[PDB]
Design an enzyme around this catalytic site. Structure first.
Site, PDB file in Angstrom:
ATOM      1  N   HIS A 135      -1.589  13.071  -5.437  1.00  0.00           N
ATOM      2  CA  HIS A 135      -2.460  13.499  -4.334  1.00  0.00           C
ATOM      3  C   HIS A 135      -1.811  13.368  -2.956  1.00  0.00           C
ATOM      4  O   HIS A 135      -2.228  14.039  -1.997  1.00  0.00           O
ATOM      5  CB  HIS A 135      -3.812  12.898  -4.531  1.00  0.00           C
ATOM      6  N   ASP A 140      -2.615  10.893 -11.668  1.00  0.00           N
ATOM      7  CA  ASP A 140      -2.227  10.968 -10.241  1.00  0.00           C
ATOM      8  C   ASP A 140      -0.831  10.440  -9.943  1.00  0.00           C
ATOM      9  O   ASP A 140      -0.752   9.423  -9.258  1.00  0.00           O
ATOM     10  CB  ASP A 140      -3.308  10.261  -9.430  1.00  0.00           C
ATOM     11  N   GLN A 197      -6.961   3.706   2.812  1.00  0.00           N
ATOM     12  CA  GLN A 197      -6.383   4.946   3.258  1.00  0.00           C
ATOM     13  C   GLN A 197      -4.977   4.728   3.834  1.00  0.00           C
ATOM     14  O   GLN A 197      -4.819   3.913   4.733  1.00  0.00           O
ATOM     15  CB  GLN A 197      -7.261   5.568   4.365  1.00  0.00           C
ATOM     16  N   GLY A 198      -4.023   5.451   3.313  1.00  0.00           N
ATOM     17  CA  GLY A 198      -2.605   5.351   3.667  1.00  0.00           C
ATOM     18  C   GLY A 198      -1.804   4.454   2.699  1.00  0.00           C
ATOM     19  O   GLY A 198      -0.574   4.457   2.768  1.00  0.00           O
ATOM     20  N   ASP A 199      -2.519   3.735   1.793  1.00  0.00           N
ATOM     21  CA  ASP A 199      -1.817   2.953   0.777  1.00  0.00           C
ATOM     22  C   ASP A 199      -1.530   3.803  -0.444  1.00  0.00           C
ATOM     23  O   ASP A 199      -0.767   3.343  -1.313  1.00  0.00           O
ATOM     24  CB  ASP A 199      -2.608   1.752   0.354  1.00  0.00           C
ATOM     25  N   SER A 200      -2.082   4.965  -0.571  1.00  0.00           N
ATOM     26  CA  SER A 200      -1.884   5.821  -1.721  1.00  0.00           C
ATOM     27  C   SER A 200      -0.436   5.974  -2.152  1.00  0.00           C
ATOM     28  O   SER A 200       0.395   6.143  -1.275  1.00  0.00           O
ATOM     29  CB  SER A 200      -2.504   7.237  -1.640  1.00  0.00           C
TER      30      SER A 200
END
Length: 224
Positions: free
Chosen positions: A41, A84, A177-180
């Site tokens: 993603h 993912d 959010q942003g650790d993905s």
């Protein structure tokens, strides 16, 4: 990362920060000199020229070695939140040495054990809806949550065997959010997953959901 602490130099020798359009975007794991493991993603369908990887630094803006991408291989069955994972090929090779090292992957067919300790790291938000993104790497330790409990939280069909969960029932510790795409490791520093998805960040009874390396090893091995 929510409820974490600052990572020390050499904690995660294989972690890479992934910027997009020159801004913070995702995390990743260096598998070898020209290959990075991230969440599908983070890269699926986006212009690959927008991305930059940075290795060998606690900072996402300076130090270490940077590279552009040569190619992106998103898991073929990536859909919704499932499968993912994506493999990134780097145009600049990154040699191991100093604070740079390559990740050790979980065994094919392994599944993290409910209750065991896992550590996640990244440059993501420190609160759900939080504005600011840390410049220096953060990490947090959370226990693995059984798939059964996880399906209780999200639905039996939302949590597949290509996912695993981690978090604290009371919440407060999680990836955000942003650790993905960044790493989740076991107590021995073995890479067991990639930060994938969740409902908000650090909410009570809403575990963080991770792409399972043990279950997706065939994909990884095909392209690493």
């Amino acid at each position: 990362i929510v409820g974490g602490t600052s990572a020390s130099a050499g904690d995660f020798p294989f972690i890479v920060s992934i910027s997009r359009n020159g801004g913070p975007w995702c995390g990743g794991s260096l598998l070898n000199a020209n290959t990075v493991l991230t969440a599908a993603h983070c890269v699926s369908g986006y212009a690959q020229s927008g991305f930059q990887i940075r290795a060998g630094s606690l900072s996402r803006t300076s130090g270490g070695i940077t590279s552009s991408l040569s190619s992106v291989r998103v898991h073929p069955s990536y859909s919704g939140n499932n499968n993912d994972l994506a493999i990134l090929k780097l145009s600049t090779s990154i040699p191991s040495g100093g604070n740079i090292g390559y990740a050790r992957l979980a065994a094919s067919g392994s599944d993290p054990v409910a209750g065991s300790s896992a550590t996640v790291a990244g440059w993501g938000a420190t609160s759900e809806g939080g504005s600011s993104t840390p410049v220096n790497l953060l990490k947090v330790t959370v226990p693995i949550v059984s798939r059964a409990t996880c399906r209780a939280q999200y639905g039996t069909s939302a949590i597949t065997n290509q996912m695993f969960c981690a978090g604290v029932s009371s919440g407060g510790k999680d990836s955000c959010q942003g650790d993905s795409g960044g790493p989740i490791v076991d107590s021995s520093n073995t890479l067991i997953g990639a930060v994938s998805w969740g409902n908000g960040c650090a909410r009570p009874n809403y575990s963080g959901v991770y792409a399972s390396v043990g279950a997706l090893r065939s994909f990884i091995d095909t392209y690493a």
